[PDB]
Amino acid sequence: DTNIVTLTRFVMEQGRKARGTGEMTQLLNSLCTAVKAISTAVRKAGIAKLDVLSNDLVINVLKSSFATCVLVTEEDKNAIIVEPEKRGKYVVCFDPLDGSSNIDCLVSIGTIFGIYRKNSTDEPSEKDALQPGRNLVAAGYALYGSATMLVLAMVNGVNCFMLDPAIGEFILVDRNVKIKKKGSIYSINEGYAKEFDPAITEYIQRKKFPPDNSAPYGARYVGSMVADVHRTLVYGGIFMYPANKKSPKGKLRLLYECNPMAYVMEKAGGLATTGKEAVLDIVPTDIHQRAPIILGSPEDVTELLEIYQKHA
Amino acid sequence: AFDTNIVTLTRFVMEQGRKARGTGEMTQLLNSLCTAVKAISTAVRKAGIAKLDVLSNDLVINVLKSSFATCVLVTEEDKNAIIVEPEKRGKYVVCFDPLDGSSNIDCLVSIGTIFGIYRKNSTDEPSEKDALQPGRNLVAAGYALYGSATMLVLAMVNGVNCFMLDPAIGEFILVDRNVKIKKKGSIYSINEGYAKEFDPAITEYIQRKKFPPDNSAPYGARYVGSMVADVHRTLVYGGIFMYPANKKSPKGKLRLLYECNPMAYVMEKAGGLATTGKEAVLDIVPTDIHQRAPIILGSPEDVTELLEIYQKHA
Amino acid sequence: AFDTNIVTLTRFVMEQGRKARGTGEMTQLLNSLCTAVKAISTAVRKAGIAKLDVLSNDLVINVLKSSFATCVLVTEEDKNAIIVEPEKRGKYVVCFDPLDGSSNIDCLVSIGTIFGIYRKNSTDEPSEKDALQPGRNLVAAGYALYGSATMLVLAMVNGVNCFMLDPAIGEFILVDRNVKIKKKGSIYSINEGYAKEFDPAITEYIQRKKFPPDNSAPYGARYVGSMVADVHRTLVYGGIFMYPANKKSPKGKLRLLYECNPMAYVMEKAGGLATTGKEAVLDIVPTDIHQRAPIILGSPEDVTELLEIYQKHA
Amino acid sequence: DTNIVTLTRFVMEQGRKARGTGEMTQLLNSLCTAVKAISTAVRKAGIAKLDVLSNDLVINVLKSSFATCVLVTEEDKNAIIVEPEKRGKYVVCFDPLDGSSNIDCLVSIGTIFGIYRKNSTDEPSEKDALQPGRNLVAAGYALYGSATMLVLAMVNGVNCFMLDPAIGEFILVDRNVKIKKKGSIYSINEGYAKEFDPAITEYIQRKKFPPDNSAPYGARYVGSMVADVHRTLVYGGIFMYPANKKSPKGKLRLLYECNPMAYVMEKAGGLATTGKEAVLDIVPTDIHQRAPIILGSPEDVTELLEIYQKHA
Numbered sequence A, D: 001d002t003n004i005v006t007l008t009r010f011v012m013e014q015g016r017k018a019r020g021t022g023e024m025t026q027l028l029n030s031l032c033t034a035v036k037a038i039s040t041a042v043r044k045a046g047i048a049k050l051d052v053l054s055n056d057l058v059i060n061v062l063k064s065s066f067a068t069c070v071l072v073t074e075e076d077k078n079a080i081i082v083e084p085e086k087r088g089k090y091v092v093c094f095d096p097l098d099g100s101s102n103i104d105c106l107v108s109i110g111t112i113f114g115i116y117r118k119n120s121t122d123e124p125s126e127k128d129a130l131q132p133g134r135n136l137v138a139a140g141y142a143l144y145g146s147a148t149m150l151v152l153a154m155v156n157g158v159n160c161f162m163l164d165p166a167i168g169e170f171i172l173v174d175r176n177v178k179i180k181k182k183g184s185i186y187s188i189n190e191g192y193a194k195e196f197d198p199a200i201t202e203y204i205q206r207k208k209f210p211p212d213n214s215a216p217y218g219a220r221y222v223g224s225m226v227a228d229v230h231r232t233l234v235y236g237g238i239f240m241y242p243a244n245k246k247s248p249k250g251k252l253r254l255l256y257e258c259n260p261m262a263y264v265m266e267k268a269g270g271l272a273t274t275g276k277e278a279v280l281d282i283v284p285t286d287i288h289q290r291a292p293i294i295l296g297s298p299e300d301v302t303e304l305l306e307i308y309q310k311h312a
Numbered sequence B, C: 001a002f003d004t005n006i007v008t009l010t011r012f013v014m015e016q017g018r019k020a021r022g023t024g025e026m027t028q029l030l031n032s033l034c035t036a037v038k039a040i041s042t043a044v045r046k047a048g049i050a051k052l053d054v055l056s057n058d059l060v061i062n063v064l065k066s067s068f069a070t071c072v073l074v075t076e077e078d079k080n081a082i083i084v085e086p087e088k089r090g091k092y093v094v095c096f097d098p099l100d101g102s103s104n105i106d107c108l109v110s111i112g113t114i115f116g117i118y119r120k121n122s123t124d125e126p127s128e129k130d131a132l133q134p135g136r137n138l139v140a141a142g143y144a145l146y147g148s149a150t151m152l153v154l155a156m157v158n159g160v161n162c163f164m165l166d167p168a169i170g171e172f173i174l175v176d177r178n179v180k181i182k183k184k185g186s187i188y189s190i191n192e193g194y195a196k197e198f199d200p201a202i203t204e205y206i207q208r209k210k211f212p213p214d215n216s217a218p219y220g221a222r223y224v225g226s227m228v229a230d231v232h233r234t235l236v237y238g239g240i241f242m243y244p245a246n247k248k249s250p251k252g253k254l255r256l257l258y259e260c261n262p263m264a265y266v267m268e269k270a271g272g273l274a275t276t277g278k279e280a281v282l283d284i285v286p287t288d289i290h291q292r293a294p295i296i297l298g299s300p301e302d303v304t305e306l307l308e309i310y311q312k313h314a
């Protein structure tokens, strides 16, 4: 196509508008070089581990960006402070590879990240990451499945880019995504049904055998956060992964799994709560703390929310 | 990278066609299915920067024919079996759904091409009828998976072998020889949306996995909602994937012929007796080319634990 | 994009192996050469972000063998012809240089795999000797070109067909059927660095192209310096490509057997009598598996204009 | 490789050093999106024209760069003035596809370009392009052959990048290229031998039968500027395309064929002249004017230069 709208052309132009520096574009642009290289590596996984390559690659591409200064990773005890020569204004929390275990089974998997603006004057620190999900600038995810695709969420909107493998570029394909209001799918790992605190099980039964003599919802759980959420985004529905007994505080870590998806959901018009408060409104204390999460088409989450405040 | 000695499926299955003198008719056929399988996957990867199931079907028909190894073909998305227009004939019946879950692409869920292949027992004319051999007289079955990778798993009589498309050269090279599914698992796989309609044998089965009666580990659940997704996970890692029957689809949704069946041969040939509930899926003399028939498959002990309940409530 | 009906060389040549009952042994063989040809090209494209000729040879040997269509193989970069280690036997002699101009990569010039294939006239044992059939008893010859595209041109007995690697699916699909070279051209192609050593027949030939005696157009010159470059340009557009003999290489540089020869069959089968100067290159009973023999090829009239001078200075 | 040095990472960092804007990086980066897309299109040319796609694509990618303001093309009568909303400080003269005719024959072909800095205060104009080749900021070429490869020439050096097709990124492979001093190859279209003005023919014979009882040079002419020059660069040698009688002013247009290669040659330590003056020192009057050119390993060009001033 002689006028393809890459991610870079899309980013740079909204950047043109904030009358800023060009760092987000450097950051995003470098980030996508990690994504292509990981997409490529997941598509030949096992022609002869991974998540450590995956982590190295994204830390390196982000350091060279000349735009970060604290990078928080799934795979690292402590957060990373970018040499002064390479610092810039962003904090990126990311899980490089989420659900790495799944590659054997051939499950769709992904990278997830969120970018905070360091607003403070002192030395880069763990504290610059301990900012509420509400404050995020940009957040999104990279998905590796039949097609590699990037949903990027910024203050103006949610957009899906798709990697064209011929030209190694991400092309803008669906614009200004908004979710279906109520939907027909519930997603939860039902093997913990003996654990689902009584709000959930209610809604589970209430949807399977709908006592309103309605069509039951279908259920789906691919078991890789990213495919479950992407699906919830496009076809509408609800995904849930709440505080159960193996996992009393949810499983999904906050700064890099729960707050990006959340941010993406609300920008798209979905909601995402814990059933006790908003995922994005939490004030993190630990960079690696976890969350119960429930996100998806607003009425369904509103439905499960009635039940949470109709059971205490 | 840059390897001098790689077992490409053509080279692989050919080391099978000649040592056992089984003409390598298998080859030509398969080779062509590899060109279709690949071409479809390219398209699915650029999917939304460019139906499909239709064009996918037409391309599989069309390439198959020219492999000179067919006489009968059966699709999901087709009428009476196609009898090969006649010059390009040979001995096989390929029955297949080229794009399983053809909706699911747009939600970026993984989808596949299945195939069942038979050899012609009739020395009469190709008639749609010939398609209708039952399971256990199948020469080769497998699938292709358009996922994070394009994996074709082939199950012939000696065993199931998984394969993977190396995009850099366009070959399905080999990564798992004589695949054997595990003996017992931790996954039950079923669409529990339909929990009203579920026959009390499966409801017991679910209740024993979820809540184990003997106080142990709950079986974790997992249902992608693509038939080819759920079998592969269930194959390589091991589980009970169950699309039984229920009022909403009273004799299953899965068109036995090229779905429950091709899968099942891949299942049993690695340790997985795929049942209906009453009869095993391969012994069911095929009544119609799109005749449907319910299916619970997977690794041996999980099947069994349900068949006991099946045997105790009828 | 997304085409339901594409003539992949396997499908193509197979529509040739069965209508003429010529066992499709041709196929298996070729198909395997396609997997080598491709794999090498991937590597050349990432060349300098990763010898080669060696590994290229080993991979071509190794894939060939498993096509079950060989008994004798001859390389540039090899000793006595390899006799196939014996289980994988069949009827053909493939003689080939896998990486022609193997230096030229680093200057990013285009390079290729040639091949000559024969069928075994001996009902005795595979002996290196069997390799040694002359040109005119060749069953199929062609080359592959690692250029801006990977183009394999195949010349069998019915004609030359050019092919092109669609990287998106890994097939050499077809773009030029029954290729015929032009009758006369505007290109003379020779390494005039060596203008000292040039035998007075070629020096006349050059002087008639450069300066046309009859006051007309100077023949434009073009010499890539890769044998596979110079033939393709000379084939599709038409010219006289001449690596004659001279003191520095007294009976040519091009190892007749798998170079001047495989090219020449592709030449004559599209209108191009490739000569030595004295005998035509296909009639020369092959004295040794790397026996060299000079070559002037191309379209008919240009060859002729030189053979007259060849016929008038001896 | 978990720390690949892309072109962007290389550019951006030398840009870090001029304490500038980031526009060259935008320009180069956008330019490479044209190159990938053209490489891809040349590699499937004829599975069923081109240079018009090729031109459109590069003009569009350059307009969106937010860094040009005059773009001069092989395929356009008049130069192009970039809408004010999208102007920035660079002038890029480019031939998008050089030797397009050749694709049938399967010849290695390429894009060529040169980037001037508009120094003046008034409205962008044709005159901002009429600047001596000596003034160029950056220049280089993209080559499409067995591998697609970008040689980029900037004030600090000549570097070869190579496109990795897996990840769609250009990787820095040979650094700070310098040519061999004298070399063994002469390149000229000898079919014009009845036209070669007496300096050339001398040197032609002087090299073929070397009267110094020396080894003759080999000759090569692929007939696509770009493959000939790339080869001259790496293996050393000389390429020549002088004023002949069909073409009394050379054939190769100045601003986009002769001055980029020239610039690349000298930065690499080669020379390039007309045999009457330096190619880069010419003051163009026409944006589309042509040149006799002779460039390559210094001694060889010095050799042919003796002869030019030993024959008048």
Ligand SMILES: O=P(O)(O)OC[C@@H]1O[C@H](COP(=O)(O)O)[C@@H](O)[C@@H]1O
Pocket (backbone or CB within 6 Å): A095, A097, A098, A099, A100, A189, A223, A224, A225, A226, A251, B220
């Ligand atoms: O390493 P990750 O990113 O946490 O990957 C596994 C994750 O953990 C979840 C699994 O949770 P359950 O098995 O408890 O449902 C998946 O959905 C997520 O991808």
Ligand SMILES: O=P(O)(O)OC[C@@H]1O[C@H](COP(=O)(O)O)[C@@H](O)[C@@H]1O
Pocket (backbone or CB within 6 Å): A218, B099, B100, B101, B102, B103, B191, B225, B226, B227, B228, B253
């Ligand atoms: O619609 P197709 O192409 O036949 O494939 C979809 C299949 O049909 C099933 C849908 O059934 P539920 O969503 O009711 O479980 C999926 O599980 C299978 O993949």
Ligand SMILES: O=P(O)(O)OC[C@@H]1O[C@H](COP(=O)(O)O)[C@@H](O)[C@@H]1O
Pocket (backbone or CB within 6 Å): C099, C100, C101, C102, C103, C191, C225, C226, C227, C228, C253, D218
């Ligand atoms: O060295 P190889 O691999 O045999 O291939 C190079 C060939 O050898 C010739 C070299 O001869 P000159 O450079 O002397 O013309 C080339 O024209 C041919 O491609």
Ligand SMILES: O=P(O)(O)OC[C@@H]1O[C@H](COP(=O)(O)O)[C@@H](O)[C@@H]1O
Pocket (backbone or CB within 6 Å): C220, D095, D097, D098, D099, D100, D189, D223, D224, D225, D226, D251
């Ligand atoms: O359209 P372009 O860029 O000018 O392409 C043809 C060019 O013109 C030259 C041909 O000149 P001669 O045929 O006169 O040698 C080639 O080397 C160049 O690529």
Ligand SMILES: [Zn+2]
Pocket (backbone or CB within 6 Å): A074, A095, A096, A097, A098, A099, A100
């Ligand atoms: Zn993870």
Ligand SMILES: [Zn+2]
Pocket (backbone or CB within 6 Å): A074, A095, A097, A098, A099, A253, A257
């Ligand atoms: Zn995670």
Ligand SMILES: [Zn+2]
Pocket (backbone or CB within 6 Å): B053, B076, B097, B098, B099, B100, B101, B102
């Ligand atoms: Zn289907």
Ligand SMILES: [Zn+2]
Pocket (backbone or CB within 6 Å): B076, B097, B100, B101, B255, B259
């Ligand atoms: Zn189906």
Ligand SMILES: [Zn+2]
Pocket (backbone or CB within 6 Å): C053, C076, C097, C098, C099, C100, C101, C102
């Ligand atoms: Zn060689």
Ligand SMILES: [Zn+2]
Pocket (backbone or CB within 6 Å): C076, C097, C100, C101, C255, C259
């Ligand atoms: Zn050779």
Ligand SMILES: [Zn+2]
Pocket (backbone or CB within 6 Å): D074, D095, D096, D097, D098, D099, D100
């Ligand atoms: Zn041009």
Ligand SMILES: [Zn+2]
Pocket (backbone or CB within 6 Å): D074, D095, D097, D098, D099, D253, D257
């Ligand atoms: Zn030009």
